[PDB]
Amino acid sequence: KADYIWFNGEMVRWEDAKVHVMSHALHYGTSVFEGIRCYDSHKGPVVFRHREHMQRLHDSAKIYRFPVSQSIDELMEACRDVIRKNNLTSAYIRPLIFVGDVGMGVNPPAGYSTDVIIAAFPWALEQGIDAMVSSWNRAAPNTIPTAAKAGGNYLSSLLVGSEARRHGYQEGIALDVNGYISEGAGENLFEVKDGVLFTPPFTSSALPGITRDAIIKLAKELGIEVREQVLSRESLYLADEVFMSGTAAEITPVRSVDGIQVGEGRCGPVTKRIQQAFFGLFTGETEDKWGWLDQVNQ
Amino acid sequence: KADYIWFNGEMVRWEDAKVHVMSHALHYGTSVFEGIRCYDSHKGPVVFRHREHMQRLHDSAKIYRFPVSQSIDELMEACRDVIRKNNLTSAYIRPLIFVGDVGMGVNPPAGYSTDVIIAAFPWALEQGIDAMVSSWNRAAPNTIPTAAKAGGNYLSSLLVGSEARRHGYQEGIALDVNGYISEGAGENLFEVKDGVLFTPPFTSSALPGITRDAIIKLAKELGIEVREQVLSRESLYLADEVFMSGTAAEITPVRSVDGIQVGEGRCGPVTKRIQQAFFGLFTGETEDKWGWLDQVNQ
Amino acid sequence: KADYIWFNGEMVRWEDAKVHVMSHALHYGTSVFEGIRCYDSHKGPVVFRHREHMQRLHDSAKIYRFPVSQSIDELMEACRDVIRKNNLTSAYIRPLIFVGDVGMGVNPPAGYSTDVIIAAFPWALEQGIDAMVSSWNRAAPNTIPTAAKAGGNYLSSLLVGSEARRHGYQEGIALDVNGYISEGAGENLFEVKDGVLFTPPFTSSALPGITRDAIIKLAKELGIEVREQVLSRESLYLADEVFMSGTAAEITPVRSVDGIQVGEGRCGPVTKRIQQAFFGLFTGETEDKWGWLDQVNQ
Amino acid sequence: KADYIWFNGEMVRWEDAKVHVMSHALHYGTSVFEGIRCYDSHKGPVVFRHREHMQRLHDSAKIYRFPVSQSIDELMEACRDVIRKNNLTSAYIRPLIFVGDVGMGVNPPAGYSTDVIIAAFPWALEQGIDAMVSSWNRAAPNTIPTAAKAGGNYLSSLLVGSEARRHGYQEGIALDVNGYISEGAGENLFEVKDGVLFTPPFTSSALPGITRDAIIKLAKELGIEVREQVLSRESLYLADEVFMSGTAAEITPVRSVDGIQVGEGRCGPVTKRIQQAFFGLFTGETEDKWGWLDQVNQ
Amino acid sequence: KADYIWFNGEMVRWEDAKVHVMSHALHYGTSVFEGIRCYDSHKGPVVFRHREHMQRLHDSAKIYRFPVSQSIDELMEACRDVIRKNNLTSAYIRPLIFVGDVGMGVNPPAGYSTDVIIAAFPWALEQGIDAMVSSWNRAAPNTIPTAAKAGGNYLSSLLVGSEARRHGYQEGIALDVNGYISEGAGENLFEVKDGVLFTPPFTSSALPGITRDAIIKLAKELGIEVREQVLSRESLYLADEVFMSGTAAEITPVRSVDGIQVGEGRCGPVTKRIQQAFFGLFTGETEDKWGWLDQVNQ
Amino acid sequence: KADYIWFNGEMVRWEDAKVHVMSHALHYGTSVFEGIRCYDSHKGPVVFRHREHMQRLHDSAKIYRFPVSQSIDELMEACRDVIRKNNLTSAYIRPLIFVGDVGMGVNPPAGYSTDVIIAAFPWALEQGIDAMVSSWNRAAPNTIPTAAKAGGNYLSSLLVGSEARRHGYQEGIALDVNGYISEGAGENLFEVKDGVLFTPPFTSSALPGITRDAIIKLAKELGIEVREQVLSRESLYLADEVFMSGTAAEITPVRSVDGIQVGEGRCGPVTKRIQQAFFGLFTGETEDKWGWLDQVNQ
Ligand SMILES: *Cc1c(COP(=O)(O)O)cnc(C)c1O
Ligand SMILES: *Cc1c(COP(=O)(O)O)cnc(C)c1O
Ligand SMILES: *Cc1c(COP(=O)(O)O)cnc(C)c1O
């Protein structure tokens, strides 16, 4: 929780940010959102890969044809505004584009506009978590677009994630409809074999993670070979290391899958190198060669 | 629109029925709903298959493990209350169970409770509509449960339905991932061949429609043979008649699929017999042998 | 061979029935055809299920949207004429609708007409044949419609059939993409287990055979239970009897599959009963309750 | 049209190149063909990748086991002869190997020979075309070989292409049975993301295009990264550029898919570079390092 | 254990029934087996559906082409002899046909014979068991025959069953590759909806259980409707009753699946009726109309 | 055959190496094994990639959770001992971990130990073999792990291999459930097209061959490009060269597939180069850069 939420261009008090119960998105999952992080760095509060996230927000809406009146730049300025207005230095930002109070028909009436909200609030990675392969599979290829970060998609992440927690594990790993590894409930999956980094392609129903992309680029900078390919379920038991990636989860090591220990049962050497290079970005140790750090105070 | 909405046991003015913008269901499609109709009949306002719908509401929540504090009977009484309080005789009822303002984590915290809302509002079938087979497929079997009427499911119905309308058709027909007929965007599909009634099973990713079930039971009463089996796409072009079924759509004839006329291009004889038997229920002509008509004033 | 071939409304001498090498159908498989049989009966030359075949010819053309100028009755009279003009009593008729000398573009230009020809010519059942399961699968559900009897479809029947011949068998049995039994290279497949008759549904990529349909109706008249269901490959080795059906093949018993003998290795009792009832139609022993025999001489 | 057509070793007048209506290929799609282009260049009339096309003609026939008595060299000489004898400088060549007047059985009798024809005739720019994703899928992997350019295969291209034109688009894009991008109705598909060229592998039911291969080699010469990988449907909406390739279509840019604009809605930068390099081959600007230009005069 | 084991026609002491460590079946899973039960009845020791099991033993060997020198009758006599010679009245019989000490090549040398063993030894109620849906799927249709009860098949049952026990459940339920219900780890699955009995067909990778078959026949005698059809995963949560069937497991009620209670959490009404009818066979209460009881003393 | 077999830590005479007929592995395929080769080299008897094979033995057991008391080094010393004790210089070693005389329940009781045996015995490459594509497919992805070399897996290799033999071929090539090339009955498959080496990934249900891995590393040393990708069935007819790899089979060229000759019908140039480099390891010509040769005499 925090004071003020950016709502359709206005800074509204947190308490007053309410929508009608007949809002389309509440009944039909017709919303698109993002997960962004603001880090306190050597150069002050900085939004990690800000433009990339807002670009994906637009891409997700594009796929479902949701009309978005704000440009990427407008959304970016609004985001910084909400962090400053709330006096935050370290936070989690949540942009949300949703179909509001329009008719009750599935197809919104022509000429409608979407409601936009940007809320920000203040904001394990060493011992490694225990994961299990879920009995639920992720969405098939040409059904509900897995490349779009839409609300309705999360019924799948709820099923996969809750099942793992009900059986005593920290996270669940979902396979696609073909029986290949897709990703965790809400984070991308990586494997390290003989010093090589492996990760499933988007065609394995894995969402194009921005943390995932950052890791791939950092790994190449470190001289580590990266192979984007379909992975079998057994590979999880044969891998030297395995870790998850996501904005909220950052880089989370996995020490065991289905009760089977992953090489030594602790954060591996390659996972360690990547973690250091990742966190080094906010200390100045890792040079920001790509322009991933967006200053809140511009 | 109407006055008053039943909200967690209280009759709230329509205008005051608001939820916070950080409600779980707005971001993750974590809601379950129903579509029910109240008809003005020979015995006054009557809710069609009231118990069946509330039972499915509970079943849908059960699958996702959403805690529901109200019993089927409590929900049924609440529903009648909202129709009476709003002085409605002919209406569309919308029960909605959703995860409200809890954390922002996908998995709701243990001990949480769901918010429940029941809104009601006042409420083609002769010439037949033109349909097209969509380029989007419905959810694969063990991914997102198609038997549950959940909010997140509707991203699929939006894609299928919007595509049909963008190309000039009234409704889209989706095939499953195997290439077999599933159903329309938001309604079940029926075919009539040589005086025989055909409809895809639930395993073709078709939601167990209550209108669908009613038609099957009425057809048997009329002495019409019903075959629940997987159907090929071509069968749509070879069928003598084809129609859709749903609470909102009732019994909608389809006169053409993909520009190909369906036997004579008008409402067929078998579709007609079923329509008459269906609407006869609210005139007294068709005996309510199953107890499908629930009086609002009990 | 024979004299005269009906070509676009005219009886042309067999040798003069030629078309240009640039005919669309020669390059793109854009043709639809039928297989019909004329039997010498107790009532003289009689075309078996004449109307049904011409109706399917029209249905196959309808699916591909090939314009057909002739009505079902016109085609039926032309067929009888070809049999009479050729002084045939027992023959195989081959109606063929094809896209002729139009452009070289895959999509024929608007306003084009198809060419139609009807050729007829004079026309292993006691012991049974040896069949093998092919390594090639039949067309997937929403690719090339298997319900339509089109020319291009036969590339598949060629692959399945030639492979069986090459290995010393009389016919090959194709499985669909799922690994279930579809049918023989160019004939439907039946199995008899505990006095029960089994056959794959059309959704197993099996063409809606007219001989297949006749067998199902005759079986029911004989009091034999018929189950139209998906069949596993192993079922071929467990079946008491197995036989193929088609216009050209009629009812052909299968005494072995993949070198494995089918219960006693001879024509089974149920296959025999069905054969007798089938051939009894042309002797008068079996009453033609359906009006399947169309007299040539009218 | 034009005068003369090479028919089984003889130059026959166009009007006289006729084949019997009972030719196998007319009824069973049993033919194999090629599409070749002759361009007027800085070195005169030149056949683009002549040997490559004739080699594929042989490969297609080999898969179906069609007997071809002519060698690659004989066919190449015949092709040049057709262009010279018809006084063509710029034209489209169509070699066709087909099963002619043999029996009516699906399996041609042992010892048969195929008929061979080679016809030639005189022969979506900077704005691009509008495409839509078809509701029809391309052939599954082990059904009808997608690597062979056979006549029967085109029933698929007809379904995909006609649907697109019926809805107002210029071309349709088909997905395979898995829901992944395969290719256009009769041309390969390319995508450009962040300066990288993407194209589906043959295993996505995409025919091994010779234009496709040329583009891949030219791209590498230009220093452009090429990734041959499975592509999701959503990628079409996220791509910076998208274009089709084929002998007839050459390099055709796609400005929109399903009504969604492809980055700026005009021919993209990378597409432009590749087009220039491609057409530069006929002006001498692009050095023919591989020997793709075969002079007619030799 | 017990004394004596029938080994290739000879009653050998239990301790002496040994085979070489280089026996084919130990390395390649090349064995076929059965599970039979001998019950103490009102007519003394009786082998339940004796001939049916021996017939399936032969059918399993036939599919893999394992040479069996003993006839069904010889095996049946041997079985009775094992029970008598070991003075057993209530026991579990295990016939095993396996490829013994032949070469080490996968394909046994022509002319080989299999070794046959028949061992017998002395032999989830009213509360039911807790089951979970496994993360492992059962064998795909045309891979390893699911209709054959072979040794190698059990690696699957081991994976499915062990996972369930590792998580605290009594049995695991496997889905096929399509995401539909197949069966339990080593027993068939039944569901009861509105007084109707449902069970997956063999094509859902479910082995043709002999107990399964018995239940279907008994159900029909009791006037209960039986529907053999593909079942979705969700159906387990919507069913009124669910139970497993197998020779060892007999009729075991399932009170919950994945932590979700199955209607009241106790043995259901229909399950009870079927259990009573089943066990009534051994008390004389249920007339043995089919001849399922084979007396040991004969 | 040979004298002595290492059995649970003791050198037992070959003839006395027996296990009870009730051993778990004989009934349920619950065993894991390896195939290792001892070559007579320029350095004397040498076990090829000894450590790698024992590591895979452990990995296969780990996937099934079979307890293994011996470490990799213990197993390696035992292996050398068996070769020495048997006075072998060139031989085939067969390590086998299996579940022995434990209960009859599929799930072995807690605290059980596995039995381990290591047997060794003394131990078409120039012309090439004739292969055919089998009608049986290899195990689907998430059914029975294809990465594990377990006994039960071989029911599949038996079906694929025996079918090829029965039709006069030397080996059968299996396709996966998708219709893509997987591998031979018990050996990995390679293809050579334009000087490029191709092989299916593990996700095509291909076991991670150790000979396969060696070939890939040798190819890279020779400067040959290696592409690990999914391959279509047709690619076998279009390839310039095709060969199989395995411990027993080493590098076996394939001169024809399905009666279709593979480029010239003899051992190809690239296959030759790889063979020479492979066998050169035991002559000293090829430097053992990886430490693949483990000396017996240490
Ligand atoms: C958001 C999300 C991710 C993580 O993406 P990041 O851009 O790295 O935050 C991974 N998987 C799913 C299903 C997601 O929704
Ligand atoms: C609600 C719904 C239907 C119609 O069900 P009825 O119970 O008949 O109203 C059909 N299909 C889908 C996808 C639905 O959500
Ligand atoms: C024509 C055909 C059949 C047989 O159908 P009939 O109408 O009974 O002749 C079976 N399979 C295929 C693929 C066919 O084309």
Ligand SMILES: *Cc1c(COP(=O)(O)O)cnc(C)c1O
């Ligand atoms: C011929 C063809 C192409 C084009 O390949 P080019 O050799 O480049 O002309 C593409 N797709 C299909 C289906 C084709 O038949």
Ligand SMILES: *Cc1c(COP(=O)(O)O)cnc(C)c1O
């Ligand atoms: C043996 C077996 C069954 C049980 O069948 P019954 O003949 O009734 O004992 C069920 N499933 C599997 C996988 C089996 O092996």
Ligand SMILES: *Cc1c(COP(=O)(O)O)cnc(C)c1O
């Ligand atoms: C053992 C095996 C191979 C060959 O692997 P190598 O380690 O090289 O001997 C190939 N396929 C299968 C199915 C195998 O079991």
